[PDB]
Amino acid sequence: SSSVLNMRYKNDKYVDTSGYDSNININGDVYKYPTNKNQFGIYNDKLSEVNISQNDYIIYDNKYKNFSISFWVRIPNYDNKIVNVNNEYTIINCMRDNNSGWKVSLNHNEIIWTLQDNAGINQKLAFNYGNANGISDYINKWIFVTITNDRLGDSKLYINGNLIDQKSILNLGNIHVSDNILFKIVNCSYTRYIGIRYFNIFDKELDETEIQTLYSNEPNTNILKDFWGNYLLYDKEYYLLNVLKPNNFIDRRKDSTLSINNIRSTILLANRLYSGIKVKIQRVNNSSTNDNLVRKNDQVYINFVASKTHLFPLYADTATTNKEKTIKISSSGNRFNQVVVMNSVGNNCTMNFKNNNGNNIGLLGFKADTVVASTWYYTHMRDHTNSNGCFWNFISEEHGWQEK
Amino acid sequence: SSSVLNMRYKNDKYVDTSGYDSNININGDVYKYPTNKNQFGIYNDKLSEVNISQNDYIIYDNKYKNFSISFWVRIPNYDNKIVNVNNEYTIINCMRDNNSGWKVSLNHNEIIWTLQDNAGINQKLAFNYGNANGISDYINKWIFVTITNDRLGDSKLYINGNLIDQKSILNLGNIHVSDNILFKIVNCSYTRYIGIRYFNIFDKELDETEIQTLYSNEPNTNILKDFWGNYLLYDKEYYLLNVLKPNNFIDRRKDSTLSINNIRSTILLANRLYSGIKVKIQRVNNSSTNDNLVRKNDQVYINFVASKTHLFPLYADTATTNKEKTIKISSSGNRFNQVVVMNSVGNNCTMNFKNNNGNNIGLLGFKADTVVASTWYYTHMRDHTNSNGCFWNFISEEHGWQEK
Numbered sequence: 168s169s170s171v172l173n174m175r176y177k178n179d180k181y182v183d184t185s186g187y188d189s190n191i192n193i194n195g196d197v198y199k200y201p202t203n204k205n206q207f208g209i210y211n212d213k214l215s216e217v218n219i220s221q222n223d224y225i226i227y228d229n230k231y232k233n234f235s236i237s238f239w240v241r242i243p244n245y246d247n248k249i250v251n252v253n254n255e256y257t258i259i260n261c262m263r264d265n266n267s268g269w270k271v272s273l274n275h276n277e278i279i280w281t282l283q284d285n286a287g288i289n290q291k292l293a294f295n296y297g298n299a300n301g302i303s304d305y306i307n308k309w310i311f312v313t314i315t316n317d318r319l320g321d322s323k324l325y326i327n328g329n330l331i332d333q334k335s336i337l338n339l340g341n342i343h344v345s346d347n348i349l350f351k352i353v354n355c356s357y358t359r360y361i362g363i364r365y366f367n368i369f370d371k372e373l374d375e376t377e378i379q380t381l382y383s384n385e386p387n388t389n390i391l392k393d394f395w396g397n398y399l400l401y402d403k404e405y406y407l408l409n410v411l412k413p414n415n416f417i418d419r420r421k422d423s424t425l426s427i428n429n430i431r432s433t434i435l436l437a438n439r440l441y442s443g444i445k446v447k448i449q450r451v452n453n454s455s456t457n458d459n460l461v462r463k464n465d466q467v468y469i470n471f472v473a474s475k476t477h478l479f480p481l482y483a484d485t486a487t488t489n490k491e492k493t494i495k496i497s498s499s500g501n502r503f504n505q506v507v508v509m510n511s512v513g514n515n516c517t518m519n520f521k522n523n524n525g526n527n528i529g530l531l532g533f534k535a536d537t538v539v540a541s542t543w544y545y546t547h548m549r550d551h552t553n554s555n556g557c558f559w560n561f562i563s564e565e566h567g568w569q570e571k
Numbered sequence: 572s573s574s575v576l577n578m579r580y581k582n583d584k585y586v587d588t589s590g591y592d593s594n595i596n597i598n599g600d601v602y603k604y605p606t607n608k609n610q611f612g613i614y615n616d617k618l619s620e621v622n623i624s625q626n627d628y629i630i631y632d633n634k635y636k637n638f639s640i641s642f643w644v645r646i647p648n649y650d651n652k653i654v655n656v657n658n659e660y661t662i663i664n665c666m667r668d669n670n671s672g673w674k675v676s677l678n679h680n681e682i683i684w685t686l687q688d689n690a691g692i693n694q695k696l697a698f699n700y701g702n703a704n705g706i707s708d709y710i711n712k713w714i715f716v717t718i719t720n721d722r723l724g725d726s727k728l729y730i731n732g733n734l735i736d737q738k739s740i741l742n743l744g745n746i747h748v749s750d751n752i753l754f755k756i757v758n759c760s761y762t763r764y765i766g767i768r769y770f771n772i773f774d775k776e777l778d779e780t781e782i783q784t785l786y787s788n789e790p791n792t793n794i795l796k797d798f799w800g801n802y803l804l805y806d807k808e809y810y811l812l813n814v815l816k817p818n819n820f821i822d823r824r825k826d827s828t829l830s831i832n833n834i835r836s837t838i839l840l841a842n843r844l845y846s847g848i849k850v851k852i853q854r855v856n857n858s859s860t861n862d863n864l865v866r867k868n869d870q871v872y873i874n875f876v877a878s879k880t881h882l883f884p885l886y887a888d889t890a891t892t893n894k895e896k897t898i899k900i901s902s903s904g905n906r907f908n909q910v911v912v913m914n915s916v917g918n919n920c921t922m923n924f925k926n927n928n929g930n931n932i933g934l935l936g937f938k939a940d941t942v943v944a945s946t947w948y949y950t951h952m953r954d955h956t957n958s959n960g961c962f963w964n965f966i967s968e969e970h971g972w973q974e975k
């Protein structure tokens with residue numbers, strides 16, 4: 168375990184599942200993601216806060232004891248102009264009237280951790296991810312934050328399992344944190360919201376191996392992710408990003424094939440995300456028990472989004488003596504006796520075209536300028552890297568990311 | 572073998588070893604590193620140039636043929652004041668009077684690649700490493716740069732084998748590079764020098780695999796590296812950095828043990844490097860090569876520098892029940908029948924204390940606030956990370972990095 172606080176959703180509210188049974192209360196309007204109620208949004212244009220009343224005996228008051236904090240945060244930039252201001256605002260507050268304890272704050276494209284003792288001596292850690300230069304891994308995406316505190320060593324800041332910033336806290340004396348942890352946007356100039364999920368406190372300094380274990384497990388790997396790090400959904404319009412060609416987008420040709428030799432236009436240095444064809448994912452075998460979540464090894468149809476309500480199947484043209492099979496839009500609504508098997512490697516999604524007789528056509532990818540299904544990828548994967556042409560992200564249009 | 576230009580040192584000059592017999596001319600005062608002549612230094616306070624007259628065959632003049640550039644660069648910041656100006660200056664120029672071709676340029680903590688066609692259309696790739704926040708892997712260090720160009724897709728900038736920037740060059744037409752590659756610091760507003768080594772042009776778009784191979788193999792993998800990325804040397808004074816404890820330095824206690832609970836002071840956010848004890852390395856038995864280069868599996872003595880005259884052996888105190896053996900300074904010059912076996916994982920150095928009888932005492936490391944030899948590390952290594960207590964860098968005091 169090591170966890171002395173596990174914030175999780177149960178029975179239309181948030182509860183502590185660590186065993187220390189800390190009390191969690193919602194005040195005002197707190198958004199719950201319908202598809203993952205572990206995820207909550209907080210606003211600053213209303214009353215909107217989560218207050219954890221910590222178990223009296225977990226409340227950190229010490230000079231020597233090690234502790235760690237982990238959570239995921241989602242920071243929308245909207246138009247990217249509203250956020251472009253040098254001002255620091257608190258999102259998670261665990262500091263007493265003494266100003267002893269810790270807090271998580273934000274700035275323009277920045278996450279900040281502050282730890283301060285009873286004497287007003289502090290240490291601050293920062294991650295500055297900056298503006299989207301091509302494709303951003305951070306803006307409007309779930310970001311896994313982990314702060315580990317060694318009282319005889321340094322405080323270390325991790326982002327998505329990677330060590331970013333570490334500074335000595337050997338100078339820090341007795342730290343007494345607030346009885347309350349307040350999830351609220353305080354002193355933000357503009358109106359916005361922030362996403363929080365899987366907030367944890369641990370009674371030790373986590374090592375890299377334990378941090379990477381939390382990073383992969385907490386999201387639930389069995390369910391595929393969209394671009395933003397949310398659960399991939401059936402019956403939902405998505406743009407396509409090829410992870411090996413982040414500057415390219417998919418367009419329809421007149422012969423009903425798909426081109427990938429289209430360059431994304433830039434807003435400053437940021438690639439446009441809402442470019443090229445939109446697709447919807449559909450279950451092969453429907454039911455009532457079935458939710459809208461896309462899981463590993465689910466058999467689906469990839470539907471091209473046409474003029475309006477109209478949806479045409481994507482299929483691999485197998486009538487060729489060349490190994491790569493051209494992807495075509497079926498005008499007739501014929502599936503050509505094919506299914507697509509969904510799978511993933513982290514946030515990268517794969518689409519394996521198979522005939523209904525169970526034979527492999529190949530993974531969705533590209534050959535020169537054309538989108539194809541190819542078996543080449545099975546034996547030519549590049550390990551522990553996003554530079555594989557069979558890796559795709561699904562981008563849903565959202566108010567959090569504006570290209571208006 | 573896709574190399575069409577390979578700049579290496581032979582017979583008191585630089586020559587093309589690719590076999591395409593391009594000419595390399597040294598004009599004026601160009602510094603050659605005595606320990607690695609393949610590395611050269613370029614000044615802007617006087618005449619300092621390397622000029623490659625490319626063989627007419629290798630001169631790039633095409634709109635479809637893929638190509639890659641690779642080289643290491645070393646950029647000192649001195650006392651981090653004179654370099655703090657927004658001023659883009661050229662270091663490598665392959666631009667025709669047409670302003671067609673490519674060039675490498677620098678700004679404050681920045682490396683820039685520019686590619687331009689005959690019609691003035693250009694694309695720029697940038698790497699901004701910024702100021703030292705604790706420890707910098709970039710400032711006054713050998714940085715491996717790799718640019719690959721797909722005329723049907725992206726130009727890609729790699730730093731130390733990692734993809735940093737990629738942008739479409741698909742809209743670029745005929746590119747005609749100049750006949751000459753000029754290594755010279757041009758339009759830098761301040762006086763400085765720049766290190767270069769292992770310049771290559773390739774006649775294809777290298778993949779991540781080939782870039783990773785050049786990164787590890789170009790500098791001799793059998794020779795250990797100092798903090799800057801130069802070869803580690805015998806009979807040379809070094810400060811110590813523990814890689815797991817970058818904010819800490821090693822001092823001597825009055826009892827002759829070594830403390831690691833000493834915190835580096837900062838200039839802005841940059842840790843001091845010239846703190847704590849000085850060590851020198853000495854061969855147990857002299858080398859047949861006639862070198863001062865520290866190699867993998869070399870048996871050495873590590874000597875504490877009390878003063879320039881007075882050197883004292885480091886030994887592991889084996890007169891204890893503890894598994895970890897406290898490192899001590901031998902006042903009497905007694906080495907207690909021990910040697911140190913040097914090895915490396917990339918730029919990380921390991922020091923294995925052993926008895927002359929062949930028994931292992933343990934890798935140099937720490938247990939809480941005390942430097943130790945410990946066999947624990949043998950069976951408790953974390954793979955694919957610098958987060959190991961038995962990983963060390965050796966910092967030589969140099970004018971390129973000032974802390975004054």
Ligand SMILES: CC(=O)N[C@H]1[C@H](O[C@@H]2[C@H](O)[C@@H](O)[C@H](O[C@H]3[C@H](O)[C@@H](O)[C@H](O)O[C@@H]3CO)O[C@@H]2CO)O[C@H](CO)[C@H](O)[C@@H]1O[C@@H]1O[C@H](CO)[C@H](O)[C@H](O[C@]2(C(=O)O)C[C@H](O)[C@@H](NC(C)=O)[C@H]([C@H](O)[C@H](O)CO)O2)[C@H]1O
Nearest residue numbers: 372373374375815894895936937938939945947948959960
């Ligand atoms: C946790 C620890 O002390 N590990 C020792 C190891 O201890 C053994 C068991 O693992 C202990 O549980 C047990 O505890 C008993 C006490 O000894 C006893 O007094 C008490 O009465 O009862 C306890 C419960 O029974 O003791 C046994 C003894 O065998 O013993 C080994 C030797 O075999 C090591 O000493 C080990 O400590 C590690 O020592 C190495 C050097 O040998 C090194 O100093 C380690 O320190 C680092 C590291 O390099 O990995 C330093 C890092 O900063 C630190 N943190 C991070 C984030 O990396 C890591 C830790 O691994 C991390 O804090 C937790 O994963 O340690 C040092 O840990």
